Amino acid sequence: SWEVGCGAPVPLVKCDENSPYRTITGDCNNRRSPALGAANRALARWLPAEYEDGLALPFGWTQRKTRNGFRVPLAREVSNKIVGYLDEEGVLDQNRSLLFMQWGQIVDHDLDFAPETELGSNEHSKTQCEEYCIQGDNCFPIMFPKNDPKLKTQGKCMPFFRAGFVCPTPPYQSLAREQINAVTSFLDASLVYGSEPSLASRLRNLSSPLGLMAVNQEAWDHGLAYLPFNNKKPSPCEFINTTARVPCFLAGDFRASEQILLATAHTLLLREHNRLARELKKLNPHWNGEKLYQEARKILGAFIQIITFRDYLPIVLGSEMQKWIPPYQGYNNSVDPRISNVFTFAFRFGHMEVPSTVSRLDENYQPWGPEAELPLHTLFFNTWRIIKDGGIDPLVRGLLAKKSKLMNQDKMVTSELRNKLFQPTHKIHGFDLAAINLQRCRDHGMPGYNSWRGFCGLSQPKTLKGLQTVLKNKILAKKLMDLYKTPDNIDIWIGGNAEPMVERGRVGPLLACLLGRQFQQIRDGDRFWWENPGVFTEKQRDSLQKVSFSRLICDNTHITKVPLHAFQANNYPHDFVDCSTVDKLDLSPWASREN
Ligand code: HEM
Ligand SMILES: *[C@@H]1O[C@H](CO)[C@@H](O[C@@H]2O[C@H](CO)[C@@H](O[C@H]3O[C@H](CO)[C@@H](O)[C@H](O)[C@@H]3O)[C@H](O)[C@H]2NC(C)=O)[C@H](O)[C@H]1NC(C)=O
Ligand SMILES: *[C@@H]1O[C@H](CO)[C@@H](O[C@@H]2O[C@H](CO)[C@@H](O[C@H]3O[C@H](CO)[C@@H](O)[C@H](O)[C@@H]3O)[C@H](O)[C@H]2NC(C)=O)[C@H](O)[C@H]1NC(C)=O
Ligand SMILES: *[C@@H]1O[C@H](CO)[C@@H](O[C@@H]2O[C@H](CO)[C@@H](O)[C@H](O)[C@H]2NC(C)=O)[C@H](O)[C@H]1NC(C)=O
Ligand SMILES: *[C@@H]1O[C@H](CO)[C@@H](O[C@@H]2O[C@H](CO)[C@@H](O)[C@H](O)[C@H]2NC(C)=O)[C@H](O)[C@H]1NC(C)=O
Ligand SMILES: [Ca+2]
Incomplete structure (x- = not known):
């Protein structure tokens, strides 16, 4: 048997089945199998899981069992010998803007989220793990190898907690462990609106019947909106500067404040929903709040899909684009829309595209002030630099005029992320994203490299000279x-x-x-x-193909000069045009006449 039975904690609802709008949870998209692609379901498996005991234990758990006859190397040691480098000179991508890196993190957050296990609010396991590096249950520490400088200064390990899984989150036992994807699999702007009934409602402004999203009431960016502040304390964003005490933002996805440019991107999209909703109210005065919200929501989701497939994917995939992605032939109800477990690691290629600094540029795209260029590690869970230091325009300009880091075999992940990552639950700027990625691969039961080479029909090297080639x-x-x-x-x-x-x-x-x-x-x-x-409608689609990220900036910021192709490297002022030269989204096709 197969067992499509286990489904436990899911947010099930009844399908309207003639609703022209997506549900918040992703349910009801597929008519024959309603839960397909919904949030809070297991990540799909394209290949069987590979665990140390066949069921749940990650390889490397028992420093006594080998993988194919060999001990697996420490996550942090692989990081030190292969992923690190010191010299940032010459590492930048000459034909990709910073936005190229940033859009990838947005698409990724819309598609997948495998949260760490909790089982802890007033817990000492979160200390037994951090304080003593005792492995057990959900604590699976990243141990430091001999001669690691963090040993001298941080402790014996980096705490790491296993990812949540389906059927419980308590111990459990039976069938292989399958991790959860807490967001909707469809590219549907769930990072803006939320993947849950609760959260989505909370993000909305229901005081007025205008279909708007709630906005910050404590701060404004030159009369432009900021996302609202998150309710919760302790707040990671105020711990990083107890003097400014600026909390994290509240958005449709929980990672919105991880780094300043991600929060910036989230603000643009929130502004665009509100811009859309009031322009739709101008054209259709009779529409109620709910109709304005859903209709604005539908358009924004179409925008993410368009930018992603027309502008972003062709420059990630390159000549392989046509090979995997055929021209669209229509909806196929037999196709599995669920995000696969391996995809959540494949899409982490973006970690090698993050540069070491972030810049704030002034109106002539010149360095903004004395401390214009900041190290990346000072900007994790940092919201005060936005609210207290210029708003988002200076950051948006940097996204357009600066470059992404180029993946390089000798220089893979910057130290800002490899030695100085800040984790919300902990107090030090001392984690390693590369070591965490590797440890997480094992936690998720990932088959090895050659197993995936086979799956894709590529050769499988068995020798040193094989790999070399x-x-x-x-x-x-x-x-x-x-x-x-x-x-x-x-x-x-x-x-x-x-x-x-x-x-x-x-x-x-x-x-x-x-x-x-x-x-x-x-x-x-x-x-x-x-x-x-x-x-x-044909006329609406006709209007939608003219959207561009450039226009999004023009309409939701006070920037007047933007490039036409925002993802490629652009030099100021030559590649920059005036906003009034950029195609606008024409919303008249949405007008709804009564008689
Ligand atoms: C800091 C982090 C980033 C920027 C400075 C950053 C950036 C990216 C890009 C550009 C990605 C894709 C093009 C991308 C993908 C995924 N990330 Fe990563 N990311 C930063 C930090 C993190 C942290 C912390 C995590 C969690 C790691 C863990 O396993 O505990 C993280 C994850 C991911 C992820 C998987 C999400 C999920 O499905 O759970 C990507 C697909 N990123 N990031
Ligand atoms: C730096 O990156 C640029 C973007 O990848 C690249 O320019 C792109 O090259 C494509 C080649 O396919 C050109 O594209 C388009 O061709 C027809 C127009 O005749 C269109 O119908 C299609 O939409 C197709 O995309 C473009 O000229 C260009 N694309 C964009 C958006 O600028 C540069 O060549 C790269 N520079 C170097 C030196 O490598
Ligand atoms: C914690 O957040 C603080 C901001 O809330 C930040 O302090 C601010 O930063 C600089 C001083 O370093 C000041 O900015 C400029 O202010 C006046 C103009 O009004 C100039 O004359 C100064 O020279 C300076 O350039 C802010 O005034 C200052 N704000 C306050 C209230 O002190 C801290 O730097 C942050 N601390 C950390 C550790 O991140
Ligand atoms: C929900 O929408 C209302 C109405 O648009 C917002 O109230 C307006 O807020 C602006 C800026 O604070 C003020 O100039 C007006 O006083 C308000 N106009 C009206 C007609 O009330 C309200 O701030 C929104 N609430 C949230 C939490 O976002
Ligand atoms: C829709 O997608 C399905 C599922 O991917 C495809 O189904 C394939 O059907 C062909 C028969 O023409 C068989 O060779 C395969 O066994 C199916 N493939 C797999 C991998 O499941 C199909 O290509 C599409 N169906 C239609 C009618 O367009
Ligand atoms: Ca989604």
Whole structure:
């Protein structure tokens, strides 16, 4: 047997089934199988899980059981010998703006979220894990190798908690452990509106019947809206500066404040929903609040889908784009729209695209003040630099005029993320995102590198010289061999990111395959995909193809000069045009005449 039975904690509701609007949870998209792609369900498995005991224990848990005959190397040791570098000179992508990196984190947050297990509010396990590095239950510490400088200064390990799973979150036992995806699988702007009934309602402004989203009432950006502050204390955003005491923002996704440019992107989208809702009220005075909200919501989701598939994916996938993603042929109800477990690691290629600094530029795109350029690590869960230091326009300009970091085999992840990451639950700027990614691969039961190469129909190197040829790098292959002792054991996150990039793309062959297949499925398996006949009218679709991120900036900021193609590297002032030259979204096709 299969067992489609286990479904426990899910947010089930009844399907209206003629509603022209998506549900908040993702349910009812697929008519024959209503829960397909919904939030709070297990991530799909394209291949069986690989755990140390076949059921739930990650490889590396029992420093006594090997993987294919060899001990798996420490997550942090692989990070130190392969992922790190010191020199930031020459590391920038010459043909990708900072926005290229930032849009990827937005798309990713719309699609997947596998939360850490809790079982702890007034818990000492969150201390037994952090304080003593005792592995057990959901605590699976990242231990430091001999000679790691963090040993001298931080402790014996980095605390790490296992990801939540379906059927309980208590102990449990029976079938293999499947992690949860707490957001909707469809590209539907759930990062703005929420994936839950609760949260979505709370984000809305129901005092007025205008279909607007709630906005901050304590601060304004030159009369432009800020997201509302989050209710919860202790707040990570005020701990980083107890003097400013500025809390984190409240948005449709819980990671909105992880870094300043992510919060900036979230603010733009919140502003766009409100802009849309009042423009729709101008054209249709009779529409009620709910209708304004849903209609504004539907348009914004179409915008994310368009920017993502027309502008972003072609420059990630490059020449592999047509290979995995065919031109759209219509909705396919037999296609599985669920985000796969391996995708959540494949999409983490963006971590190698994050540069070490962030800039605030003034109106002539010149350095904004004395401390214009800031190290990235000072900006994790930092909301005060926005509210107290200039608003979002200076940050938006930097997104347009600065570059992303280029993935480089000798320089993979910046130290701002590799040694100085700040985690919401803890107090130090001392975590390692690369080590966490590797440890999480094991936590999630990921098959190894060659298993995924096979899945994609690519060769599977078994020797040093095999890897060399595939990676087209002798030194990298050798370092990987000395740590893993067999390409079969290489964790998918580093194996996939170590491959040279495809022509015109920014990921290698393995990743192009994993990414490409996933994106083909959420497009083809989405009943509300924007091009699906009947979702929008021919005239509405005609108006929607003229959207651009440039216009979004023009309409929701006080920036007047923007580039036409925001994802490629743009130099000021030559590549910048005046906002009034940029195509506007024409909303007259939405006008609704009575008689
Ligand atoms: C800080 C972090 C970023 C920027 C400075 C950053 C950036 C990205 C980009 C550009 C991505 C894709 C193009 C991307 C993907 C995914 N991330 Fe990552 N990210 C930062 C920090 C984190 C942290 C912390 C996590 C959680 C790690 C854990 O396993 O505990 C993280 C995750 C992910 C993730 C998987 C999300 C999920 O499904 O649970 C991506 C797909 N990022 N980030
Ligand atoms: C830096 O990156 C740029 C963006 O990837 C790249 O320019 C792009 O090259 C494509 C090639 O396909 C050109 O595209 C378009 O071709 C027809 C127009 O005849 C259109 O119908 C299609 O939509 C297709 O996209 C563009 O000229 C260009 N795309 C954009 C958006 O600018 C640069 O060439 C790169 N620069 C270098 C030196 O590598
Ligand atoms: C914690 O947040 C504080 C802001 O809420 C921040 O202090 C602010 O930063 C600088 C001083 O370093 C000041 O900015 C400018 O103010 C006047 C003009 O009004 C100039 O003459 C100064 O020279 C300075 O350039 C702010 O006034 C200051 N605000 C206050 C109330 O002190 C702290 O730097 C943050 N601390 C940390 C550790 O991040
Ligand atoms: C919900 O919407 C109302 C109405 O648009 C907002 O109230 C307006 O707020 C602006 C700015 O504070 C003021 O100039 C007006 O006094 C208000 N206009 C009206 C007609 O009441 C209200 O702030 C919104 N609430 C939230 C939490 O976002
Ligand atoms: C819609 O997608 C489904 C599921 O991916 C496809 O179904 C395939 O049907 C062909 C028969 O033409 C078989 O070769 C396969 O066994 C199915 N493939 C898989 C991987 O399940 C199909 O391509 C699409 N269906 C239509 C009618 O367009
Ligand atoms: Ca979603």
